[PDB]
Ligand binder design. Structure first.
Ligand SMILES: COCCN1CCN(c2nc(SCCc3ccc(OC)c(OC)c3)c(C#N)c3c2COC(C)(C)C3)CC1
Ligand SMILES: COCCN1CCN(c2nc(SCCc3ccc(OC)c(OC)c3)c(C#N)c3c2COC(C)(C)C3)CC1
Lengths: 33, 1037, 46, 200, 100, 100, 50, 50
C-alpha cells in the first residue's frame, strides 16, 4: 500500500496524506505526523 | 327557498346527520400518509454493468438507451449519471399532473428498442425501471448483534425470507435490499489457474456448461410408442446447489482421469452481487430494506402491519439477528392522528366557550358542539370521492378549516341571537327574520371563499401539488360548511334554545363576566367614538392607510421568497467524501470516527447511525459514504439545541478536525431535489462533441467563476466527483496475438478476473442466486498484479499479462452525468442568503457566456420548476384579487362597491408579515396559505359589517354617512361577537413545537397574532371603507 | 387527557389574556386613535 | 391430514380433492460427469444429446405454405421410452469415437412432484371440493374452516378464486343491510318529520 | 421437454422474484409442471384496470426483466389477461379419419 | 449527405426533440456509422473471410467490463482505488485501421 | 322465525347453472401414460354415449 | 406537371397532392385487399390480381 518513487522527491520531505479536499496549493498546514 | 329545508325543519336536521355516517363509512375507507404525491412522476432506470467505469457504462449502456428516448411523452428533464461501479441511473422527471403508469410503460418498452444493443452482460444483470422517486415509507435495518453473520450473511436472509414477505403486506409498493443476496462468489486464484494451465475462460466455460439445467426429456413421452405403460420425468444435470458442489465442477481431465476440480482453482464461497455497499449500524454490520408506499398511499395500516408481519419473524431469526428502524414515515403522523383530533375537541370547547361567553347556557349552547363534528368527517368524505388522502398537508389543511367551519357556525346562530335581542321575537321567526334581508348574503358568507380556490387549481408542479391539497380542503370547507350553515344551522335555531327577554342585552346576568360584560360596554361607546372620530378624521385616516401598506412591500422584499422549512423529520443524512480514488477501507475508517462522533458525543440526541460505506446520493463509489442517522422523539430530547440544524451544525464544526474526508451533513425533505431555498440547480451541457475534458475545463472555468461572484453565486460545488485516476491497460493487440494468444481470451480473462463476471445462476435452498467468477482480493489489488494473470496461447503455453500489457495512469471522471442525450455536469448553487434566484439563474447564463463553443445550459430539480415559472404570486393572485371584485359586486349590486372589501387585503397580510418579525420565519408555501387563511377572514367581517349597511341602504333608508354610523351602532353588539368569534379558535397555536412547528406557531401567530390586524385592527377601518367608496362614487348627488 | 387538564386552567387563562392584550390594543391605542385629528380628504372627482 | 380431516365428513363435503399432483417417480440420470469427460466427451456434447433427443428442442423456423412453423429435433419415440433407451444414445468424444450413455451415466429413480404450485414465492398445494346435494357452500366452506383451523401454525389456509368472492360476501352482504337501511332509517325522518316515525 | 423440479428454478422463480409490491394485488399463484409449462397467475383487485394490468404485469415482469436468466423470455412467454371464461370453444374434427 | 446527417443526428435531433412542444422527431438520414468496406481481392490476398473480419471487429472493438484496482471487496490493508480501462470501443477510422 | 330461519338457511354464493356442459376429469396413478389415460377416455366416452 | 411527365421516358413520373389524411386520392378513392387463404403462395395470388 505504498508507492515507490525513483525521482521527484528527496529524503526528509513532508508528504501531505490526509485532507486533499481542503488543501489547495499555498495554505498553512497543521502538519502533524 | 333557503327555508324550503326550514318549512319542515327536521328535513334539514337529518341530512347533516346522514353525512355523519355516509361520510363515516368513507372516513374509514380513507387512507393515511404524512404526504400526498407531491413529486412529479419520475422513472428511475437502474442499469448495472459490474466492474466498469463511467466512460464504459456511459457508452455501452447509457448512450444506447439515451438514443432510444426520442418519441416518449411529457418529460421535464431526463437527468442521468454513469459511474464507476457500472451503474446507470437515468431519471426521467416527467411533467407533473400527468400520470405515471401510462407514462412509465411508454419509456419502459421502448427501452426494448435497444435491449439487444446493450451488451449481453448488462442485459444479463439488470435494467430495472421503477416509477418512483426517493419517497421511502420506512427503512428496516436488519442487524447482527453477535458477529457470526457478516454484512452479506444478513442480506440473503432478507431476500429469501423477508423481501417477499414484507412485499406481501398491503400498502407496500417497492422493496429494495442493500444486499442483495448470496451470489455464488466464485473466486479465482491466478497462481492456481497457472498450475493447471487454465484461464478464466475455462472456469466460465465449465460453469456455463456443467452448471445448467437441461430440458431433460421424459421417459414415455410424446408420442408414446403404441404399447407404453411408463411415464417419468428425467432430472438431468440440476443447477448445482452448493459451495461444495461447485467444488467438484469439472475442468480439463486427461484421458486417464487426472481431474481438475474447480475447488483447486477457486476459493468458492457465497457472497454478494456487489460489495460496493458496506452498511454499518452502531459499529456492527447490517443489511436493510427500503420500503415504499403503494400508490394509493397507506400509512396507518401499512406500518402497523409491517411491524405486525415482522412479528412472525423473531422466531426465525438466526444467532443475534435484530431488526431496527433507522427511518419511518409514520411516527410523524402516529401522534398527529390523535392530537389534531384532540386540539379540535378543545377547539369545539373554544367555540363552546363562545357560547359560554355571552349566553352562559347549558342547553341553548349545544348547537356548535353538534355543528362541528358533522363538517370534519364530511371534509374527508368529499375528498374521498376525489380520492385524496388525509395528510400533513391536509390534516393541517383541516386544523385550519376548523377555524373556517366555526366562523360560519357562530355568526348565523348569533345573527339569529342578534335579531331576537332588540325586539324580543322568538327564534322560530328569527331564523327567517334574520334571513329575510340577507338571503342574498349567505351566498356571500363563502363567496370570497368562492374566490380563493379558483387559482388554487392554477399552480403547477411540486409546489403546485401543495396548493391543491389546500384547494379541495377549502372547497369542502366551503361547500359542506355552508350547506350545513345555510340549511342546517338556520333550522338549528328552533328547538334546543332558551329564548330570551324583551331584547336581551343581558339584564339579569350576575357574574364577574357580567361586570366585564359592561367592559363589553367599554367598547360600546368607544368603538362608536372610534368610528365617529374616524369620520371626523376621515381625510387624515384616508391618507394614513396607503402608508401603513408601504411597510408591506418593504417587509415583503426583505421577507425572503424561500421554500418549505426544514422539518425535524427525525433523521438527518451525513455525507462523507474522501479524496479522489480513496478506498473502502479508509471510508469505513472515517465512518468509524463519524459513528463514534455521533454516538459518543451525542448519545442524547442520536438514536443510532445506519452508516453505508460506498453509497453516495451524490454518486456511489468507494470515496463516498452516507450515515443515515436516527434521532429520537422530543419526549426524549428537549429544545432548539436538539433539533436538526443545531445537531448538524455542531457536527460540521468537528468535521473540520477529521482529515482525509470532507465530512458534512444536512437535513431531508421527502424529495431530495428541492434546491438551496433560493434554489438553482444547473446542468451545463456539451453540444459540439468536445469530449469531457474540454467540458471539464468549462467546469474549471465556471466553478471558478462561481467563486468569482460570492455576492450572487455563493456555493461553488458540483454534485459529481473529481476526476479520479483510473488505470489504463495497453492490451497491446499486435503484440498479444503475435505472442500467441487470441484477444477474446484476453478480455474474458481481464474482464472476469478484475471485473467479476456473472456466469449463470445456481440454486441455493430453492432460490435462484447468481454465480460470479472474480479474481480473489489479493490478486487484483495493485497495478503489479496485472502480471500475475496468465492467459492461454494458441498451443496451451501460459502467458503472463506483463509480457504484453503495458499500463499507464490517467484521469477519468468516475461519475459522468448527461443532458438528455449529450454530456453534462450537475452544477449546484445558491443565491446569496436572502436574495432572489432569478438573477442568480440569469447571471450563470451570462457567466456561461464566458465559456466556449458547444456549451449549452439547462436546469433540473426545482430549477426547471423555476424555468417554467419564476413566481406565480403577483399576477395569479390578481385572480385572487380581481375574482374577489367580481363576486362581491354581485352582492352590493354596484361597480366599485368591492373597493371597500379590497382594503382588508393589506390588513390581513400585515398580520402575516409581522409574524415573520416576532418569530422570524421566511416566505414559504405555508406562508402563502397564511395569506389566504387571513385575507379569507378579513373579507368576511368586511362583508358582515358593510352588507348590513346594504340593509341600511336597501331595506333601511338612512344616509350612507350615518348608515355607516348605524353600521357601527346597530352592528355594535355583533362586532365583539364576530371578530372574537373566530379568534378564540386559534388558541393552541403557540406552545406546540416539535415536528414542524412554524406551520402552526409562526403561521400560528400568523393566525393568532396575525388575525389581530384582521379582527381587532381591521374593523376600526372597515365601516369607513364603505364611505371612502361612497363619498367619491356617490349616487346621491 | 391532561391537555384537557391544561384546557381547564389554560383555556381559562390564555383566553382572557388574549382578551386582555387586545384591551391594551383597542383601548390603549384606541385613545391615540382619537388624539389624531384633522381633515385631508381629496374630494376632487366628487 | 386435511383429507384425514375434511374428506372424512362425507355427508356435507362431497369430493374434497387436491389439485397438486402426488409425487410421481422422477428418473434421475447421474451423468457420472468425470467419466463423461475422461471418456473424451465434452459435456455439452452430452447435455445437448441428453436434452435435445429425449427433450425435444426448438431449432429455428421454416416456411410451410408461406407460414412460419418451428423445427423440432427429438428422438423417435421407440428410442426414448425406457431406461434401456439411455443405453442407445451415442455421444462423440474428442477423437471422433462414439460412446454410449450406458458407459457412464448411472441412472436411478427418485420422487418428484410435477405440479409444484407456488403462491407469491411460497410453494403451495391447492385443494378442491364441492358441497352437499341439497346443501350450500357456506355450510361447507365454514365446515372446511372447522377443518382448516385444525392444523397448527406453519401451513396456512387461503380462500380465493371463487372462494375469495364469497369470503367477501360474508364480510359485506349481510353488512349491506346496515348502511342501506340506516340511510332509510334516516330517509323517513326527512319525509315524516320526526325521529320516532323511523321507529315504526 | 424439461422437468418440473427445475422448471420453477429456470423459469418461475425468476419471474416470481420481480414481483415487488404488485399494484392492487390479491394473490399471485403459479404452477410449474412436468411438461415445462408455467402459469403464473397474477390476480388483482376488482375495479383495478385490467388494461393497465397486462401493462403493469409486464411492468412487474418488465419492471426487472434481466434479473432473468434470459432464456426465460427466449423460450417464448405470453402475458395474457386470462379471464378464463370462454366464448364458443369450437372443436374441429375429422369425420373419416384421414387427417390426424 | 451523410456528412450532414450525423450533424443533424449528433447535434440537432437531441436538441429539437426536447425543444418545447416537440414530440416525435423522425430523423431522415443516419448517424455516421463506421462503414467497413471490404475488398475481396484483398481478402484473397490474406486468405480471410468476412467471418474473420467480423470476428475480429467483434473482439478487438469490444468494450470490456474491466473492473477496478481496489475493487470490492478489498484486501484488509489497502489504500488504492482506480478503475481499469480495457479495450475502449475504438473511436476512429484510424483506430479501426489498426484493428488486427 | 326470521332469526332462526336465516342462519339455518344455507348460505351459498351462486347456484349451479344448467350450462349445457359439464367437465369430467380423470386422474390416473402418478406416472401413467397418455396411452392409458386415453384408454380410460375410451370408456368414459363409451359411458357417455351408451 | 403530369403532361410534361409523359415526355419523360424510362419512368412513370406523376405527381399528386396531400389531403388531411393522404390515403384516398381523387376525393372518393377506395382501397381494397385480395387476401390469400389456401396457402397458394404469392404468384397465384398475383395471377388473381393480374
Ligand atoms: C445504490 O443504492 C440506492 C439506495 N439508496 C437510497 C436508499 N438508501 C437508504 N438506506 C437506508 S438503510 C440501508 C439500506 C442499505 C443496506 C445495504 C447497502 O449496501 C448493500 C445499501 O447501499 C446500497 C443500503 C436508509 C435508512 N435508515 C435510508 C436510505 C435513504 O435515505 C433515507 C434517509 C430515507 C434513509 C440507501 C441508498
Ligand atoms: C424515416 O423515413 C420514413 C419517413 N417517411 C415519411 C416522411 N417522408 C417525408 N420526408 C421528407 S424529408 C427526407 C429526408 C431524408 C434525408 C436522408 C435520407 O437518407 C437516409 C432519407 O431517407 C430516408 C430521407 C419530407 C420533406 N421535406 C416530407 C416527407 C412526407 O411528406 C411531406 C410533405 C411531409 C414532406 C419521408 C418518408
Amino acid at each position: 500500500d505504498k508507492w515507490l518513487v525513483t525521482e521527484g522527491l528527496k529524503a526528509g520531505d513532508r508528504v501531505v496524506i490526509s485532507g486533499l479536499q481542503k488543501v489547495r496549493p499555498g495554505v498553512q498546514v497543521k502538519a502533524q505526523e | 327557498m333557503p327555508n324550503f329545508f326550514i318549512d319542515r325543519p327536521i328535513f334539514a336536521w337529518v341530512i347533516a346527520i346522514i353525512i355523519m355516517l355516509a361520510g363515516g363509512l368513507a372516513i374509514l375507507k380513507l387512507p393515511v400518509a404524512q404526504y400526498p404525491t407531491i413529486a412529479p412522476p419520475a422513472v428511475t432506470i437502474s442499469a448495472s454493468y459490474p466492474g466498469a467505469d463511467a466512460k464504459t457504462v456511459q457508452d455501452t449502456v447509457t448512450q444506447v438507451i439515451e438514443q432510444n428516448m426520442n418519441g416518449i411523452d411529457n418529460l421535464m428533464y431526463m437527468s442521468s449519471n454513469s459511474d464507476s461501479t457500472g451503474t446507470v441511473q437515468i431519471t426521467l422527471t416527467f411533467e407533473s399532473g400527468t400520470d405515471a403508469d401510462i407514462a412509465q410503460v411508454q419509456v419502459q418498452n421502448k427501452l426494448q428498442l435497444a435491449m439487444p444493443l446493450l451488451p449481453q452482460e448488462v442485459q444479463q444483470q439488470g435494467v430495472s425501471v421503477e416509477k418512483s422517486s426517493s419517497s421511502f415509507l420506512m427503512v428496516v435495518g436488519v442487524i447482527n448483534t453477535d458477529g457470526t453473520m457478516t454484512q452479506e450473511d444478513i442480506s440473503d436472509y432478507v431476500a429469501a425470507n423477508m423481501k417477499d414477505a414484507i412485499s406481501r403486506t398491503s400498502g407496500v409498493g417497492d422493496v429494495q435490499l442493500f444486499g442483495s443476496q448470496y451470489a455464488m462468489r466464485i473466486w479465482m486464484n491466478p497462481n492456481e489457474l497457472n498450475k493447471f494451465q487454465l484461464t478464466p475462460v475455462d472456469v466460465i466455460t465449465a460453469i456455463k456448461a456443467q452448471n445448467a439445467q437441461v430440458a431433460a426429456g421424459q421417459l414415455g413421452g410424446t408420442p408414446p410408442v403404441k404399447g407404453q405403460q411408463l411415464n417419468a420425468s428425467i432430472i438431468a444435470q440440476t443447477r448445482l446447489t452448493s459451495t461444495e458442489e461447485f467444488g467438484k465442477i469439472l475442468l480439463k481431465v486427461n484421458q486417464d482421469g487426472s481431474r481438475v476440480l474447480l475447488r483447486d482453482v477457486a476459493k468458492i464461497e457465497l457472497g454478494g452481487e456487489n460489495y460496493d455497499i458496506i452498511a454499518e449500524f452502531n459499529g456492527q454490520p447490517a443489511s436493510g430494506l427500503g420500503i415504499k408506499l403503494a400508490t394509493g398511499a397507506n400509512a396507518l395500516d401499512t406500518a402497523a402491519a409491517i411491524r405486525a408481519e415482522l412479528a412472525k419473524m423473531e422466531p426465525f431469526f438466526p444467532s443475534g439477528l435484530k431488526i431496527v428502524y433507522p427511518y419511518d414515515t409514520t411516527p410523524f403522523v402516529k401522534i398527529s392522528i390523535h392530537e389534531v383530533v384532540k386540539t379540535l375537541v378543545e377547539a369545539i370547547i373554544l367555540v363552546f366557550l363562545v357560547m359560554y361567553l355571552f349566553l352562559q347556557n347549558f342547553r341553548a349552547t349545544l348547537i356548535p358542539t353538534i355543528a362541528v363534528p358533522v363538517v370534519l368527517l364530511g371534509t374527508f368524505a368529499v375528498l374521498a370521492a376525489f380520492g385524496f388522502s388525509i395528510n400533513t398537508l391536509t390534516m393541517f389543511g383541516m386544523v385550519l378549516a376548523i377555524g373556517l367551519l366555526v366562523d360560519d357556525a357562530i355568526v348565523v346562530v348569533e345573527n339569529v341571537e342578534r335579531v331576537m335581542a332588540e325586539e324580543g321575537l322568538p327564534p322560530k321567526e328569527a331564523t327567517r327574520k334574520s334571513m329575510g334581508q340577507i338571503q342574498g348574503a349567505l351566498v356571500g358568507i363563502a363567496m370570497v371563499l368562492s374566490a380563493v380556490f379558483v387559482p388554487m387549481a392554477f399552480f403547477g408542479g411540486s409546489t403546485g401539488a401543495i396548493y391543491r391539497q389546500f384547494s379541495i380542503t377549502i372547497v369542502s370547507a366551503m361547500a359542506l360548511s355552508v350547506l350545513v350553515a345555510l340549511i342546517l344551522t338556520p333550522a338549528l335555531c328552533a328547538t334546543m334554545l332558551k329564548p330570551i327577554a324583551k331584547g336581551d342585552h343581558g339584564e339579569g346576568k350576575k357574574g364577574f363576566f357580567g361586570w366585564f360584560n359592561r367592559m363589553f360596554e367599554k367598547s360600546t361607546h368607544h368603538y362608536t367614538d372610534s368610528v365617529g372620530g374616524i369620520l371626523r378624521s376621515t381625510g387624515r385616516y384616508l391618507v394614513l392607510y396607503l402608508i401603513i401598506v408601504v411597510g408591506m412591500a418593504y417587509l415583503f422584499v426583505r421577507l425572503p421568497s424561500s421554500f418549505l422549512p426544514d422539518e425535524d423529520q427525525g433523521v438527518f443524512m451525513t455525507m462523507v467524501q474522501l479524496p479522489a480514488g480513496a478506498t473502502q477501507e479508509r471510508t469505513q475508517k472515517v465512518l468509524n470516527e463519524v459513528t463514534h462522533y455521533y454516538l459518543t458525543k451525542e448519545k442524547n440526541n442520536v438514536e443510532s447511525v445506519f452508516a453505508v460505506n460506498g453509497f453516495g446520493f451524490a454518486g456511489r463509489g468507494q470515496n463516498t459514504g452516507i450515515a443515515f442517522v436516527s434521532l429520537k422523539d422530543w419526549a426524549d430530547r428537549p429544545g432548539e439545541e436538539n433539533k436538526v440544524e443545531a445537531i448538524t451544525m455542531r457536527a460540521t464544526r468537528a468535521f473540520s478536525q477529521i482529515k482525509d474526508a470532507m465530512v458534512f451533513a444536512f437535513n431531508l425533505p421527502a424529495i431530495v431535489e428541492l434546491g438551496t431555498a433560493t434554489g438553482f440547480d444547473f446542468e451545463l451541457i456539451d453540444q459540439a462533441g468536445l469530449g469531457h475534458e474540454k467540458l471539464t475545463q468549462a467546469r474549471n472555468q465556471l466553478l471558478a467563476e462561481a467563486a468569482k461572484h460570492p455576492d450572487m453565486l455563493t456555493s461553488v460545488r458540483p454534485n459529481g466527483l473529481e476526476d479520479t485516476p483510473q488505470f489504463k491497460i495497453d492490451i497491446d493487440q499486435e503484440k498479444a496475438q503475435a505472442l500467441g494468444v487470441s484477444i477474446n481470451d484476453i478480455n474474458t480473462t481481464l474482464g472476469a478476473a478484475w471485473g467479476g463476471s456473472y456466469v449463470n445462476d445456481f440454486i441455493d435452498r430453492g432460490r435462484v442466486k447468481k454465480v460470479y467468477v472474480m479474481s480473489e482480493a489479493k490478486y487484483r489489488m495493485l497495478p503489479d498484479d496485472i502480471g500475475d494473470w496468465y492467459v492461454r496461447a494458441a498451443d496451451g503455453q501460459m502467458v503472463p499479462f506483463s509480457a504484453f500489457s503495458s499500463s499507464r495512469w490517467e484521469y477519468g471522471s468516475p461519475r459522468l452525468e448527461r443532458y438528455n442525450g449529450l454530456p453534462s455536469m450537475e452544477i449546484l448553487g445558491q443565491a446569496a442568503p436572502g436574495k432572489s434566484t432569478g438573477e442568480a439563474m440569469e447571471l450563470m447564463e451570462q457567466l456561461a457566456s464566458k465559456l466556449p463553443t458547444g456549451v449549452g445550459y439547462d436546469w433540473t430539480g426545482m430549477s426547471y420548476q423555476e424555468r417554467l415559472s419564476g413566481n406565480q404570486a403577483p399576477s395569479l393572485y390578481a385572480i385572487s384579487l380581481i375574482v374577489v371584485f367580481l363576486c362581491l359586486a354581485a352582492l352590493y349590486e354596484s361597480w366599485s362597491i368591492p373597493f371597500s372589501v379590497m382594503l382588508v387585503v393589506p390588513l390581513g397580510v400585515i398580520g402575516a408579515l409581522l409574524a415573520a418579525t416576532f418569530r422570524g420565519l421566511t416566505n414559504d408555501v405555508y406562508f402563502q396559505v397564511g395569506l389566504l387563511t387571513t385575507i379569507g377572514l378579513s373579507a368576511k367581517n368586511a362583508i358582515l359589517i358593510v352588507e348590513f349597511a346594504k340593509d341600511l341602504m336597501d331595506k333601511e333608508g338612512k344616509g350612507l354617512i350615518e348608515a355607516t354610523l348605524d353600521a357601527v351602532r346597530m352592528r355594535l353588539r355583533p362586532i365583539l361577537m364576530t371578530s372574537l368569534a373566530f379568534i378564540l379558535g386559534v388558541m393552541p397555536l403557540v406552545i406546540s413545537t416539535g415536528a414542524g412547528s412554524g406551520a402552526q406557531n409562526a403561521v400560528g401567530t400568523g393566525v393568532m397574532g396575525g388575525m389581530v390586524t384582521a379582527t381587532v385592527l381591521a374593523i376600526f377601518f372597515v365601516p369607513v371603507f364603505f364611505v371612502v367608496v361612497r363619498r367619491r362614487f356617490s349616487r346621491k348627488n | 387527557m391532561l391537555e384537557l387538564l391544561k384546557s381547564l386552567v389554560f383555556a381559562v387563562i390564555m383566553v382572557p389574556v388574549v382578551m386582555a392584550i387586545i384591551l391594551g390594543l383597542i383601548y390603549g391605542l384606541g385613545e391615540v386613535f382619537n388624539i389624531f385629528s384633522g381633515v385631508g380628504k381629496k374630494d376632487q372627482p366628487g
